[PDB]
Design an enzyme around this catalytic site. Structure first.
Site, PDB file in Angstrom:
ATOM      1  N   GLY B 159     -19.804  24.885  22.039  1.00 49.25           N
ATOM      2  CA  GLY B 159     -19.098  23.706  21.561  1.00 49.25           C
ATOM      3  C   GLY B 159     -19.905  22.425  21.707  1.00 49.25           C
ATOM      4  N   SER B 160     -20.872  22.437  22.621  1.00 52.30           N
ATOM      5  CA  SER B 160     -21.718  21.271  22.852  1.00 52.30           C
ATOM      6  C   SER B 160     -23.013  21.322  22.041  1.00 52.30           C
ATOM      7  CB  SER B 160     -22.025  21.131  24.348  1.00 52.30           C
ATOM      8  OG  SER B 160     -20.846  20.840  25.074  1.00 52.30           O
ATOM      9  N   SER B 210     -22.197  18.604  27.775  1.00 54.09           N
ATOM     10  CA  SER B 210     -21.468  19.643  28.496  1.00 54.09           C
ATOM     11  C   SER B 210     -20.126  19.113  28.982  1.00 54.09           C
ATOM     12  CB  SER B 210     -22.300  20.137  29.687  1.00 54.09           C
ATOM     13  OG  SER B 210     -21.603  21.145  30.395  1.00 54.09           O
ATOM     14  N   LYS B 211     -19.035  19.703  28.493  1.00 58.43           N
ATOM     15  CA  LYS B 211     -17.694  19.305  28.914  1.00 58.43           C
ATOM     16  C   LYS B 211     -17.550  19.369  30.431  1.00 58.43           C
ATOM     17  CE  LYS B 211     -12.762  20.043  28.047  1.00 58.43           C
ATOM     18  NZ  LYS B 211     -11.739  20.767  27.234  1.00 58.43           N
ATOM     19  N   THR B 212     -17.952  20.500  31.008  1.00 53.74           N
ATOM     20  CA  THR B 212     -17.826  20.741  32.448  1.00 53.74           C
ATOM     21  C   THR B 212     -18.987  20.161  33.243  1.00 53.74           C
ATOM     22  OG1 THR B 212     -18.920  22.897  32.151  1.00 53.74           O
ATOM     23  CG2 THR B 212     -16.573  22.908  32.066  1.00 53.74           C
ATOM     24  N   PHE B 213     -20.152  20.066  32.596  1.00 56.45           N
ATOM     25  CA  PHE B 213     -21.428  19.754  33.253  1.00 56.45           C
ATOM     26  C   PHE B 213     -21.801  20.757  34.353  1.00 56.45           C
ATOM     27  CE2 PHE B 213     -24.144  16.474  31.740  1.00 56.45           C
ATOM     28  CZ  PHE B 213     -25.117  16.231  32.708  1.00 56.45           C
ATOM     29  N   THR B 214     -21.377  22.011  34.181  1.00 62.67           N
ATOM     30  CA  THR B 214     -21.738  23.078  35.121  1.00 62.67           C
ATOM     31  C   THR B 214     -22.224  24.350  34.434  1.00 62.67           C
ATOM     32  OG1 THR B 214     -19.447  23.900  35.299  1.00 62.67           O
ATOM     33  CG2 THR B 214     -20.019  22.200  36.796  1.00 62.67           C
ATOM     34  N   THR B 215     -22.203  24.371  33.100  1.00 61.08           N
ATOM     35  CA  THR B 215     -22.667  25.536  32.347  1.00 61.08           C
ATOM     36  C   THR B 215     -24.110  25.845  32.711  1.00 61.08           C
ATOM     37  OG1 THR B 215     -21.147  25.011  30.547  1.00 61.08           O
ATOM     38  CG2 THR B 215     -22.827  26.556  30.038  1.00 61.08           C
ATOM     39  N   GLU B 217     -26.643  27.611  31.380  1.00 60.02           N
ATOM     40  CA  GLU B 217     -27.708  27.434  30.390  1.00 60.02           C
ATOM     41  C   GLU B 217     -28.061  25.958  30.232  1.00 60.02           C
ATOM     42  OE1 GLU B 217     -25.349  30.979  28.439  1.00 60.02           O
ATOM     43  OE2 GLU B 217     -24.919  29.392  29.905  1.00 60.02           O
ATOM     44  N   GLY B 272     -14.027  22.374  23.441  1.00 57.40           N
ATOM     45  CA  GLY B 272     -15.444  22.359  23.086  1.00 57.40           C
ATOM     46  C   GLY B 272     -15.680  22.588  21.602  1.00 57.40           C
ATOM     47  N   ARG B 273     -15.006  23.595  21.059  1.00 59.55           N
ATOM     48  CA  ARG B 273     -15.168  23.955  19.652  1.00 59.55           C
ATOM     49  C   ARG B 273     -14.431  23.009  18.696  1.00 59.55           C
ATOM     50  NH1 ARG B 273     -12.379  27.790  22.475  1.00 59.55           N
ATOM     51  NH2 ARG B 273     -10.143  27.975  21.948  1.00 59.55           N
ATOM     52  N   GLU B 358     -13.432  32.065  18.547  1.00 63.61           N
ATOM     53  CA  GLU B 358     -13.113  31.713  19.935  1.00 63.61           C
ATOM     54  C   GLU B 358     -11.680  31.199  20.068  1.00 63.61           C
ATOM     55  OE1 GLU B 358     -15.124  28.601  22.446  1.00 63.61           O
ATOM     56  OE2 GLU B 358     -16.158  30.375  23.215  1.00 63.61           O
ATOM     57  N   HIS B 389     -28.374  37.124  -2.571  1.00 65.28           N
ATOM     58  CA  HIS B 389     -29.484  38.057  -2.737  1.00 65.28           C
ATOM     59  C   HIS B 389     -29.744  38.929  -1.509  1.00 65.28           C
ATOM     60  CE1 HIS B 389     -30.241  36.153  -6.527  1.00 65.28           C
ATOM     61  NE2 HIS B 389     -30.498  34.986  -5.964  1.00 65.28           N
ATOM     62  N   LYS B 519     -19.818  35.751  32.669  1.00 62.49           N
ATOM     63  CA  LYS B 519     -20.428  34.774  33.577  1.00 62.49           C
ATOM     64  C   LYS B 519     -20.481  35.306  35.012  1.00 62.49           C
ATOM     65  CE  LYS B 519     -18.938  30.741  30.894  1.00 62.49           C
ATOM     66  NZ  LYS B 519     -18.300  29.399  30.981  1.00 62.49           N
TER      67      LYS B 519
END
Lengths: 557, 557
Positions: B159-160, B210-215, B217, B272-273, B358, B389, B519
């Protein structure tokens, strides 16, 4: 009915599925047999790296695999394969051989078509490609102002685009000393326009990829490129310095302004979606060098030999095909997800959309009778871990059964931060298939909710949402490193999977009659769009859309 | 059972489908009624261009549409919608409001959560975005060595990532005078490595989304970027000139080491999405300008008002949703293809893979009942003519029913060759849905083969392969031009389609519990990859794959 459904090995398989499949639980299969991984995987040593095809997380037992192998045999897979390799005209609707295997036949064992060995001509064109690559990569080939070429632009559609694009993307690390490569495919003018905007006519060379050299979209794009070029160069004789052809149409190539010496030929037994191994791969060889291109061919050759020589029960492409038959014709799964945990492989799924879907999206059998069963699946996917944050919600907790192939190299091309990124990437690769198999039980989720401090009422309400049913099957395909050789082997592996499935369905994997109607109708609409006169020659929707187009095209926003 | 299956209007629809659907033949429906296009299309005038939603090539009659609308009413769609717009906490598993509509609420009519208007804070952050965009784009904002910013790098996943990427790609013509934009998302080190290889720390601005700022990746990529930056800058105070954050988590933003004044805030009621309309859209606004970002929001707002105020039977997102229900729950179609005939829209389908899958890839209802019916479809596609094609062979002549939305702008951003490219593009857009609808009867194919001069034997051999069964339903969505405004309207239209389907299925479109297990399992595997010792803690496949990784990672290739 049809050949497949009239086959007693298929009937037995379908009957077994009906009676027993509900009892197949991945959790239980692994618990009952600690040798499951050992017995349901293939560790292939190519001598240039290993390819592990782990199919153990599938809803299969020894008995199911035996039934599937028996079905492959009784559908004539062994005979059909030998017929492909020997140059038999197995593309029966077009009466053509199917010889992408000849293109990468590094052993040079004669393969005859109409009594004549095709290998001398295969090798002649490869030699021509090698010479051209030397000329361009060295800087010896000069543009119209006398400067070395810095940019190569492949113009082509479908099979003349997807392979070269996917492979140069996947093999980007091997492109040191090579020109930048660009791919123009869409007729949408945006594609060529945005490409040319960042190029110099002095240092750009265009590769026009079209067997007939009359392909509408490709030639239109090519003619637009030529117009742009000639605006700067102002000399029609300069075209030969900046345009080459992957084609057999000498006359049309010459008429375009290309030197016929720079026409790189291929043959009617090279299907478009199986053509990257031929002259069509010229942009690959230019970008990564001819040595790396030969390595790509060699990897495919290794897999061809594996496919040819290996007993069906331990034959990688055959087993992948059989698992697909199981999910398609017994479970009724519409789709097949390709999920490479590799950014370089970001166009791998799109490639096999053509390779798989254009091959096996068929409904007429060899006898001419309609199938009364499913054929090719819808192929889709995005690279991991990105997909985890997009659509894995549905894979884990939706209402669809989706067979997934997870792919990853053990070694990364970019071991940054002492391998930290790749460690995480690998951990996710492994965890996701584990998660899909295991799920999460109510007793596991309940404890988590309790520990999180949820009230008895909140816990009760949340519990079913937190449960993962699991039992979602996957293949894990893991390989030492994504080198040219290994990539070649992987592509060939899926090519042969597709071949095996096509034979089992009794369809022709090698024709594409389904493209014709759209082409016919488009040719009729083209001239109707010009001018303001009303179009009434179609159904009311087509007419109505054309009316909207004519009304809206002059509106200023 | 579940709410949908217990619903008598649904059972009526399904019974009708069972008794009558085989009698629906598109070719014959069009022949019998010249008013079909008129009766089954919506020509929406936004005052900033028209959007024509032509749903006439669908397997529907007036009676079917009536039953679907009646089902929507019975499922409480209008009340649920009103609840979303009013700030009711309709994300019931997370006890959250769902207010992406507030983000683009240009009217500024108060929308309350917990008794408090959210609009002041929405507008405060929008004003902050506007000011920041002016400073960066004008060249006023300087890096640590005193140079203007030339490159912006969004770091985020899911989502980010997908929204900002899709929108900047789609609105590329509107980016003149803006900084180059890059997207880093995969943990795969290839992604950040090849991005940083092309950048200077002096002139690059990183946007940590990042919504959470903990993801994992995103934070890992962000830390890698910071380390690269600090290796050059050698001054922690310099980070404030080169790193900004888009988040709801002030504490974690501060902990990472980002200035509180460098944080662009959003709220828990922004999924997020559904987040590109918020602070997450900063990379869009930087690339195309805040004015164009406002136009994007305004287009979404227009569509929000359309959804809110229009009777169900003439309500675009509602009708799209209902047609989907028809194909999913009555015909059993697993997939939904999105096929924009627009190269700029090349990431539109990938965006709605998250948006749709999602959201609606769910299996538990509001009552706590497991669904006993299908929910969200598998979304896929490539832009035309590329996808055309690659895989249309299967759409035309495979064994799957695949609802397709074809989308195109009337006006191209690049009217090169006096409109020639766009003429061809439009012709194919129109012809493909015409072809899918019409097909080609045996007698029609026979006549074609006859005219080609085929012998009786050759004609008979080829005939069945040349038949197109047709009756393949499509939507055609045509709009004046793909401006920021129109794009905003189109994205919002699908958002609301997804909402309507979710309400009808009685599921929560706004949570995503299905991402948690993967996760958890990845965190467990991470430390196990270290060192040479065998892992025995998992199932034999996970163990075996880990063994392969350990054995293969030191091999020189």
């Amino acid at each position: 009915m049809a050949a497949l459904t009239r086959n007693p090995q298929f009937q037995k398989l379908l009957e077994w599925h009906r009676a027993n499949s509900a009892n197949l639980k991945l959790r239980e299969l692994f618990e009952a047999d600690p040798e499951r991984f050992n017995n349901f995987s293939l560790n292939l040593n190519t001598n240039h790296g290993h390819i592990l095809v782990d199919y153990s997380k599938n809803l299969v037992s020894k008995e199911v695999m035996q039934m599937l192998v028996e079905l492959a045999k009784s559908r004539g897979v062994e005979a059909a394969r030998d017929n492909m390799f020997s140059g038999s005209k197995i593309n029966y609707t077009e009466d053509r051989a199917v010889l992408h295997v000849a293109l990468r036949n590094r052993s040079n064992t004669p393969i005859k078509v109409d009594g004549k060995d095709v290998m001398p001509e295969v090798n002649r064109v490869l030699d021509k490609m090698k010479s051209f690559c030397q000329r361009v990569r060295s800087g010896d080939w000069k543009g119209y102002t006398g400067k070395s070429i810095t940019d190569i632009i492949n113009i082509g559609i479908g099979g003349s685009d997807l392979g070269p694009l996917m492979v140069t993307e996947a093999l980007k690390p091997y492109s040191k000393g090579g020109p930048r490569v660009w791919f123009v495919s869409n007729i949408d003018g945006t594609h060529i326009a945005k490409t040319l905007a960042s190029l110099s006519p002095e240092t750009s060379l265009f590769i026009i990829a079209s067997k007939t050299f009359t392909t509408q979209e490709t030639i239109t794009n090519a003619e637009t490129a030529k117009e742009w070029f000639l605006e700067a160069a102002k000399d029609p004789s300069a075209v030969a310095k900046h345009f080459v052809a992957l084609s057999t149409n000498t006359a049309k190539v010459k008429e375009f302004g290309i030197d016929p010496q720079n026409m790189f030929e291929f043959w009617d037994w090279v299907g478009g979606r199986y053509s990257l191994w031929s002259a069509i791969g010229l942009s690959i060889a230019l970008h990564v060098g001819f040595d790396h291109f030969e390595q790509l061919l060699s990897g495919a050759h290794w897999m061809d030999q594996h496919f040819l020589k290996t007993p069906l029960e331990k034959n990688a492409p055959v087993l992948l095909a059989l698992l697909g038959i199981w999910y398609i014709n017994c479970y009724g799964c519409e789709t097949h997800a390709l999920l490479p945990y590799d950014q370089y492989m970001h166009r791998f799924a799109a490639y096999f959309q053509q390779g798989d879907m254009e091959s096996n999206g068929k409904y007429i059998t060899k006898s001419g009778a309609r199938v009364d069963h499913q054929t090719g699946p819808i192929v889709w996917g995005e690279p991991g871990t990105n997909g985890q944050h997009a659509f894995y919600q549905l894979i884990h907790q939706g209402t669809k059964m989706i067979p997934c192939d997870f792919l990853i190299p053990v070694q990364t091309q970019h071991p940054i931060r002492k391998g930290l990124h790749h460690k995480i990437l690998l951990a996710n690769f492994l965890a996701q298939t584990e998660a899909l198999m295991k799920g999460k039980l109510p007793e596991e989720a309940r404890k988590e909710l309790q520990a999180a401090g949820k009230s008895p009422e909140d816990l009760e309400k949340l519990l079913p949402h937190k449960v993962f049913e699991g039992n979602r099957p996957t293949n894990s395909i893991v390989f030492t490193k994504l080198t040219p050789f290994i990539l070649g082997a992987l592509i060939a592996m899926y090519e042969h999977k597709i071949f095996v499935q096509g034979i089992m369905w009794d369809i022709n994997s090698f024709d594409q009659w389904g493209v014709e109607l759209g082409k016919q109708l488009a040719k009729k609409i083209e001239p109707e769009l010009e001018g303001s006169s009303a179009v009434t020659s179609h159904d009311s929707s087509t007419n109505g859309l054309i009316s909207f187009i004519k009304q809206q095209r002059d509106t200023k926003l």
